[PDB]
Structure formats: structure tokens, C-alpha cells
Amino acid sequence: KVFGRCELAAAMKRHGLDNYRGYSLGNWVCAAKFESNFNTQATNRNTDGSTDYGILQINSRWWCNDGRTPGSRNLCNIPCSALLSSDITASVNCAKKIVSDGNGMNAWVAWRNRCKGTDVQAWIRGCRL
Template sequence: MKAVWLLFFLACVLPMGQGKIYERCELAQKLKEMGLDGYAGYALDNWVCMAYHESRYNTAATHYNDYDGSTDFGIFQINSRYWCQYGSESSANICRTPCSALLTCNLAPDVACAKIVVTESADGMGAWVAWRAYCQGQDLSQYVAGCDL
């Protein structure tokens, strides 16, 4: 049994580990444990809604942006132009993390960077287009409904 847990742990923390598609309540629980409920004034349902519309809860999601050549990474689709470092691409790398760290099932780098984005951006969660389009000003109770939080 210890060997199974060790393998799972290593798969999650090593950069080459596989991503994970979370279930809604599973993600809500993890994000709550990691301190996002109420962070910067945003309730947990905002974070879960945003993650759904950005990546469909997929930690391995990427999206290339034709308009500026940047790429969005991970469950929160964090952008390589400003927040993370993607290879030798020019980046402000405000989160001081490689973008590849945002693609594993280990949510710690994603959450740490999301906390920086929401506090450093003048728009708060408005930094995420999907949050503005689908979550802002909406009843988001469905995103945590039925979850044992």
C-alpha cells in the first residue's frame, strides 16, 4: 500500500508527472484546503467556476494565444507572458515558476500563482477572461452544491 501512495506522490510532484482532470467537489475541497475560500475577498465558488470555464478542471490544459504568441497553462490557465516562464520565451515570470509546474496534478504551484495573480492584478479575478464572462455577478452556488466542505 505504501508503494502505491509513493508512486502517486511521485507522479504528482515530478514535473513530468501526468495531469489530472478533477471532479468538481474534489477540486472544491482541494482549493479550500489550500486557502482559496475567501482569498482576496473571493468565495470558493468563484475559484471553482473560473477553473471550470478556463480548463474544465484539467491540470494539463494548455491554450496557445495567436494574438501575442503566449500560452496559458494548467487548471487556471495562467499566462506565460506575465506569470510563468515557458522555456526561453520572454516573460515577466511574476510567479517565479516554470509553466511546466502548472501542468501536473500537484495544485500547489497553480494555487500559489493564482494568489499572486489575484492580488497583483488591478482587476482581481477579472484578470481571468472566463471569470468575467461566466462567473462575475452570477449565482455560483451550483459550483459547490452537494460538496462536503
């Protein structure tokens, strides 16, 4: 599924991500924009041989199991394929654990490089939330 911006904002808000660990909804929508372009089916191979899955490009190195990431963890206890679903419940549940790990949203390099410090509320502008 390719989400609309306000459609994804609503879905994220509904699932308790707005101000989760102090991160406004605009931060999460900005991260999703530059990680996935709001595409639930997005996969990207990392140099280390791990893969990033779904709207928030969650890494198989730590968070999900893809069976092809030697020496990796599955801390969200989910198949990585569960992170490509049109229903964002599993990506959100797993993202709550990532953002809670100590470095907040810096875990998402695209968030740090492209969202952090910027006018993130622009990402929810005009949305009926």
C-alpha cells in the first residue's frame, strides 16, 4: 500500500505513535516519507547484508526475522514480511520498541539527516486528525 500523507498520519495517531517517547506525529510522518515514501512494501538491502522493511525501514539485524541475516536478533519477535503489510500495526508496535532503545528517533538515519530540527509539523499540515 502507498499511503497518503494525512492517511498515514491518521493511522500512526490511531496506533499511539503521536508524541510517543516525546516525538510529535510530524516526526513519524517525516521519517516514513524519507524511509519508504509511504510505501508499506519498501525493502532495501544494507551493506552489512541485513534488510530494511516497510514504512519505517525496520532492520533485520536487530528487530525482525528474515532468515538471511547471520548473527542477527529478532527483538520485535516478528517475521520481517509482517512489516510489509497494508496494516501498519506491526511496524508501529516494532517502532515503539526501536525508539525506546536509548537513541530516540536517531535510530532512523534518514530521520536524523532529513527530519531532525526541521519544521516537521508541515508533514501533518491540512490533515483532519
